[PDB]
Amino acid sequence: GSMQILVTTISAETIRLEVEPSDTIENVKAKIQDKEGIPPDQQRLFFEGKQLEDGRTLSDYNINKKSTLLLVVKF
Amino acid sequence: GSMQILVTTISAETIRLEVEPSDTIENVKAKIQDKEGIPPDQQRLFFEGKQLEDGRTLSDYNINKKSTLLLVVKFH
């Protein structure tokens, strides 16, 4: 149109979570809901590029102390 | 204690804005409030690394058609 401009809107935060190696990623998503207020269904967890899927644990993906996890959310 | 992991929470979206080259940054910030719902003083605008100031126009920073602007917004 007249002059169409693009605005790259960014929002970012780093949340620390006290978890057990026995904790399922379902339980990890539940801990994020208490900390921020995002439902587990719309949450997308990542580690080493691989999308963390429910039914498995943090030990299965070999996640230990001081591990960087990636959470991608809407708007 | 037992195991303390870090979760890098990211949220991103691109907003399309019909603006005039005569428009000031305070007017562009007002247009973002209508599109998303963020107050103009709590939003930081950028172009070519330089932080865009409320007083100056889009012509002053040489912003034209198909220009990518950066808006950094608070967590929640």
PDB file of N, CA and C in Angstrom, chain B residues 3-53:
ATOM      1  N   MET B   3      18.391 -30.973  40.808  1.00  0.00           N
ATOM      2  CA  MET B   3      18.597 -30.692  39.386  1.00  0.00           C
ATOM      3  C   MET B   3      17.853 -29.414  38.990  1.00  0.00           C
ATOM      4  N   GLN B   4      18.610 -28.338  38.717  1.00  0.00           N
ATOM      5  CA  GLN B   4      18.062 -27.040  38.312  1.00  0.00           C
ATOM      6  C   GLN B   4      18.401 -26.723  36.850  1.00  0.00           C
ATOM      7  N   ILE B   5      17.394 -26.884  35.973  1.00  0.00           N
ATOM      8  CA  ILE B   5      17.477 -26.681  34.520  1.00  0.00           C
ATOM      9  C   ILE B   5      16.994 -25.289  34.105  1.00  0.00           C
ATOM     10  N   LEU B   6      17.524 -24.775  32.982  1.00  0.00           N
ATOM     11  CA  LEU B   6      17.130 -23.470  32.452  1.00  0.00           C
ATOM     12  C   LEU B   6      16.233 -23.669  31.240  1.00  0.00           C
ATOM     13  N   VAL B   7      15.134 -22.910  31.175  1.00  0.00           N
ATOM     14  CA  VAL B   7      14.176 -22.979  30.072  1.00  0.00           C
ATOM     15  C   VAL B   7      14.103 -21.606  29.392  1.00  0.00           C
ATOM     16  N   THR B   8      14.657 -21.524  28.171  1.00  0.00           N
ATOM     17  CA  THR B   8      14.699 -20.317  27.349  1.00  0.00           C
ATOM     18  C   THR B   8      13.342 -20.145  26.646  1.00  0.00           C
ATOM     19  N   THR B   9      12.427 -19.397  27.287  1.00  0.00           N
ATOM     20  CA  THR B   9      11.079 -19.134  26.781  1.00  0.00           C
ATOM     21  C   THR B   9      11.116 -18.002  25.746  1.00  0.00           C
ATOM     22  N   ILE B  10      10.690 -18.305  24.504  1.00  0.00           N
ATOM     23  CA  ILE B  10      10.650 -17.356  23.385  1.00  0.00           C
ATOM     24  C   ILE B  10       9.240 -17.244  22.811  1.00  0.00           C
ATOM     25  N   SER B  11       8.819 -16.006  22.510  1.00  0.00           N
ATOM     26  CA  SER B  11       7.536 -15.661  21.909  1.00  0.00           C
ATOM     27  C   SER B  11       7.831 -14.599  20.851  1.00  0.00           C
ATOM     28  N   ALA B  12       7.396 -14.836  19.598  1.00  0.00           N
ATOM     29  CA  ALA B  12       7.643 -13.899  18.495  1.00  0.00           C
ATOM     30  C   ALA B  12       6.510 -13.824  17.466  1.00  0.00           C
ATOM     31  N   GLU B  13       6.315 -12.627  16.864  1.00  0.00           N
ATOM     32  CA  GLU B  13       5.310 -12.348  15.827  1.00  0.00           C
ATOM     33  C   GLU B  13       5.663 -11.087  15.026  1.00  0.00           C
ATOM     34  N   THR B  14       5.411 -11.104  13.698  1.00  0.00           N
ATOM     35  CA  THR B  14       5.648  -9.943  12.837  1.00  0.00           C
ATOM     36  C   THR B  14       4.329  -9.192  12.588  1.00  0.00           C
ATOM     37  N   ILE B  15       4.360  -7.863  12.762  1.00  0.00           N
ATOM     38  CA  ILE B  15       3.200  -6.988  12.605  1.00  0.00           C
ATOM     39  C   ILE B  15       3.346  -6.098  11.358  1.00  0.00           C
ATOM     40  N   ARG B  16       2.314  -6.087  10.500  1.00  0.00           N
ATOM     41  CA  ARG B  16       2.281  -5.272   9.284  1.00  0.00           C
ATOM     42  C   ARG B  16       1.665  -3.915   9.607  1.00  0.00           C
ATOM     43  N   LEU B  17       2.352  -2.820   9.235  1.00  0.00           N
ATOM     44  CA  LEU B  17       1.851  -1.475   9.508  1.00  0.00           C
ATOM     45  C   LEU B  17       1.870  -0.559   8.300  1.00  0.00           C
ATOM     46  N   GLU B  18       0.690  -0.015   7.955  1.00  0.00           N
ATOM     47  CA  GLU B  18       0.524   0.957   6.883  1.00  0.00           C
ATOM     48  C   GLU B  18       0.820   2.321   7.517  1.00  0.00           C
ATOM     49  N   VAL B  19       1.959   2.917   7.144  1.00  0.00           N
ATOM     50  CA  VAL B  19       2.424   4.204   7.677  1.00  0.00           C
ATOM     51  C   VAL B  19       2.739   5.202   6.562  1.00  0.00           C
ATOM     52  N   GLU B  20       2.846   6.490   6.915  1.00  0.00           N
ATOM     53  CA  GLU B  20       3.212   7.565   5.988  1.00  0.00           C
ATOM     54  C   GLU B  20       4.686   7.909   6.255  1.00  0.00           C
ATOM     55  N   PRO B  21       5.507   8.322   5.258  1.00  0.00           N
ATOM     56  CA  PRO B  21       6.908   8.676   5.571  1.00  0.00           C
ATOM     57  C   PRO B  21       7.004   9.896   6.499  1.00  0.00           C
ATOM     58  N   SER B  22       5.910  10.687   6.567  1.00  0.00           N
ATOM     59  CA  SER B  22       5.748  11.865   7.419  1.00  0.00           C
ATOM     60  C   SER B  22       5.465  11.481   8.887  1.00  0.00           C
ATOM     61  N   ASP B  23       5.029  10.222   9.153  1.00  0.00           N
ATOM     62  CA  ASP B  23       4.701   9.731  10.501  1.00  0.00           C
ATOM     63  C   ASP B  23       5.901   9.696  11.442  1.00  0.00           C
ATOM     64  N   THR B  24       5.699  10.191  12.679  1.00  0.00           N
ATOM     65  CA  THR B  24       6.698  10.201  13.756  1.00  0.00           C
ATOM     66  C   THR B  24       6.687   8.824  14.436  1.00  0.00           C
ATOM     67  N   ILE B  25       7.730   8.499  15.229  1.00  0.00           N
ATOM     68  CA  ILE B  25       7.838   7.213  15.935  1.00  0.00           C
ATOM     69  C   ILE B  25       6.714   7.064  16.993  1.00  0.00           C
ATOM     70  N   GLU B  26       6.296   8.183  17.638  1.00  0.00           N
ATOM     71  CA  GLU B  26       5.197   8.185  18.616  1.00  0.00           C
ATOM     72  C   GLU B  26       3.850   7.783  17.980  1.00  0.00           C
ATOM     73  N   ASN B  27       3.661   8.095  16.675  1.00  0.00           N
ATOM     74  CA  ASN B  27       2.466   7.729  15.908  1.00  0.00           C
ATOM     75  C   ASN B  27       2.515   6.254  15.504  1.00  0.00           C
ATOM     76  N   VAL B  28       3.721   5.732  15.186  1.00  0.00           N
ATOM     77  CA  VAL B  28       3.937   4.328  14.808  1.00  0.00           C
ATOM     78  C   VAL B  28       3.730   3.446  16.052  1.00  0.00           C
ATOM     79  N   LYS B  29       4.162   3.943  17.232  1.00  0.00           N
ATOM     80  CA  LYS B  29       4.000   3.279  18.528  1.00  0.00           C
ATOM     81  C   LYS B  29       2.517   3.192  18.911  1.00  0.00           C
ATOM     82  N   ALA B  30       1.739   4.236  18.558  1.00  0.00           N
ATOM     83  CA  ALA B  30       0.295   4.340  18.775  1.00  0.00           C
ATOM     84  C   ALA B  30      -0.449   3.335  17.888  1.00  0.00           C
ATOM     85  N   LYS B  31       0.094   3.061  16.682  1.00  0.00           N
ATOM     86  CA  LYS B  31      -0.457   2.101  15.722  1.00  0.00           C
ATOM     87  C   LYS B  31      -0.251   0.660  16.198  1.00  0.00           C
ATOM     88  N   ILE B  32       0.831   0.410  16.973  1.00  0.00           N
ATOM     89  CA  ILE B  32       1.154  -0.900  17.553  1.00  0.00           C
ATOM     90  C   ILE B  32       0.166  -1.210  18.698  1.00  0.00           C
ATOM     91  N   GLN B  33      -0.253  -0.164  19.451  1.00  0.00           N
ATOM     92  CA  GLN B  33      -1.218  -0.268  20.550  1.00  0.00           C
ATOM     93  C   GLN B  33      -2.596  -0.725  20.029  1.00  0.00           C
ATOM     94  N   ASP B  34      -2.965  -0.313  18.800  1.00  0.00           N
ATOM     95  CA  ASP B  34      -4.225  -0.695  18.161  1.00  0.00           C
ATOM     96  C   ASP B  34      -4.177  -2.125  17.624  1.00  0.00           C
ATOM     97  N   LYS B  35      -3.004  -2.551  17.118  1.00  0.00           N
ATOM     98  CA  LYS B  35      -2.801  -3.879  16.533  1.00  0.00           C
ATOM     99  C   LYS B  35      -2.568  -4.987  17.565  1.00  0.00           C
ATOM    100  N   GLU B  36      -1.755  -4.723  18.614  1.00  0.00           N
ATOM    101  CA  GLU B  36      -1.427  -5.721  19.640  1.00  0.00           C
ATOM    102  C   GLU B  36      -2.009  -5.431  21.033  1.00  0.00           C
ATOM    103  N   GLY B  37      -1.902  -4.184  21.493  1.00  0.00           N
ATOM    104  CA  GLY B  37      -2.387  -3.758  22.804  1.00  0.00           C
ATOM    105  C   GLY B  37      -1.280  -3.500  23.807  1.00  0.00           C
ATOM    106  N   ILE B  38      -0.194  -2.845  23.355  1.00  0.00           N
ATOM    107  CA  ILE B  38       0.975  -2.516  24.173  1.00  0.00           C
ATOM    108  C   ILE B  38       1.112  -0.982  24.272  1.00  0.00           C
ATOM    109  N   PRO B  39       1.220  -0.396  25.497  1.00  0.00           N
ATOM    110  CA  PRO B  39       1.368   1.070  25.609  1.00  0.00           C
ATOM    111  C   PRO B  39       2.648   1.606  24.951  1.00  0.00           C
ATOM    112  N   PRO B  40       2.580   2.815  24.328  1.00  0.00           N
ATOM    113  CA  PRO B  40       3.733   3.340  23.567  1.00  0.00           C
ATOM    114  C   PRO B  40       5.039   3.613  24.321  1.00  0.00           C
ATOM    115  N   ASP B  41       5.000   3.916  25.630  1.00  0.00           N
ATOM    116  CA  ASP B  41       6.248   4.202  26.344  1.00  0.00           C
ATOM    117  C   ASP B  41       6.965   2.945  26.856  1.00  0.00           C
ATOM    118  N   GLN B  42       6.255   1.803  26.965  1.00  0.00           N
ATOM    119  CA  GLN B  42       6.857   0.548  27.422  1.00  0.00           C
ATOM    120  C   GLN B  42       7.346  -0.338  26.250  1.00  0.00           C
ATOM    121  N   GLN B  43       7.347   0.212  25.024  1.00  0.00           N
ATOM    122  CA  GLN B  43       7.816  -0.489  23.827  1.00  0.00           C
ATOM    123  C   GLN B  43       9.035   0.204  23.200  1.00  0.00           C
ATOM    124  N   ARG B  44      10.112  -0.565  22.954  1.00  0.00           N
ATOM    125  CA  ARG B  44      11.357  -0.044  22.381  1.00  0.00           C
ATOM    126  C   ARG B  44      11.497  -0.400  20.900  1.00  0.00           C
ATOM    127  N   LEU B  45      11.530   0.629  20.024  1.00  0.00           N
ATOM    128  CA  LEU B  45      11.675   0.457  18.574  1.00  0.00           C
ATOM    129  C   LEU B  45      13.112   0.599  18.093  1.00  0.00           C
ATOM    130  N   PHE B  46      13.491  -0.222  17.094  1.00  0.00           N
ATOM    131  CA  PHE B  46      14.835  -0.256  16.515  1.00  0.00           C
ATOM    132  C   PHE B  46      14.812  -0.399  14.997  1.00  0.00           C
ATOM    133  N   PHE B  47      15.862   0.133  14.349  1.00  0.00           N
ATOM    134  CA  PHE B  47      16.120   0.064  12.911  1.00  0.00           C
ATOM    135  C   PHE B  47      17.602   0.342  12.684  1.00  0.00           C
ATOM    136  N   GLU B  48      18.303  -0.613  12.031  1.00  0.00           N
ATOM    137  CA  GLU B  48      19.745  -0.574  11.739  1.00  0.00           C
ATOM    138  C   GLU B  48      20.601  -0.491  13.023  1.00  0.00           C
ATOM    139  N   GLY B  49      20.069  -1.050  14.112  1.00  0.00           N
ATOM    140  CA  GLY B  49      20.712  -1.075  15.421  1.00  0.00           C
ATOM    141  C   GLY B  49      20.360   0.096  16.317  1.00  0.00           C
ATOM    142  N   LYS B  50      20.092   1.266  15.708  1.00  0.00           N
ATOM    143  CA  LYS B  50      19.762   2.522  16.392  1.00  0.00           C
ATOM    144  C   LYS B  50      18.368   2.487  17.007  1.00  0.00           C
ATOM    145  N   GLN B  51      18.249   2.941  18.268  1.00  0.00           N
ATOM    146  CA  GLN B  51      16.966   2.989  18.968  1.00  0.00           C
ATOM    147  C   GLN B  51      16.161   4.180  18.460  1.00  0.00           C
ATOM    148  N   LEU B  52      14.984   3.894  17.888  1.00  0.00           N
ATOM    149  CA  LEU B  52      14.090   4.903  17.325  1.00  0.00           C
ATOM    150  C   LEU B  52      13.413   5.723  18.417  1.00  0.00           C
ATOM    151  N   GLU B  53      13.617   7.064  18.353  1.00  0.00           N
ATOM    152  CA  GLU B  53      13.117   8.104  19.268  1.00  0.00           C
ATOM    153  C   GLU B  53      11.756   8.645  18.815  1.00  0.00           C
TER     154      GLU B  53
END
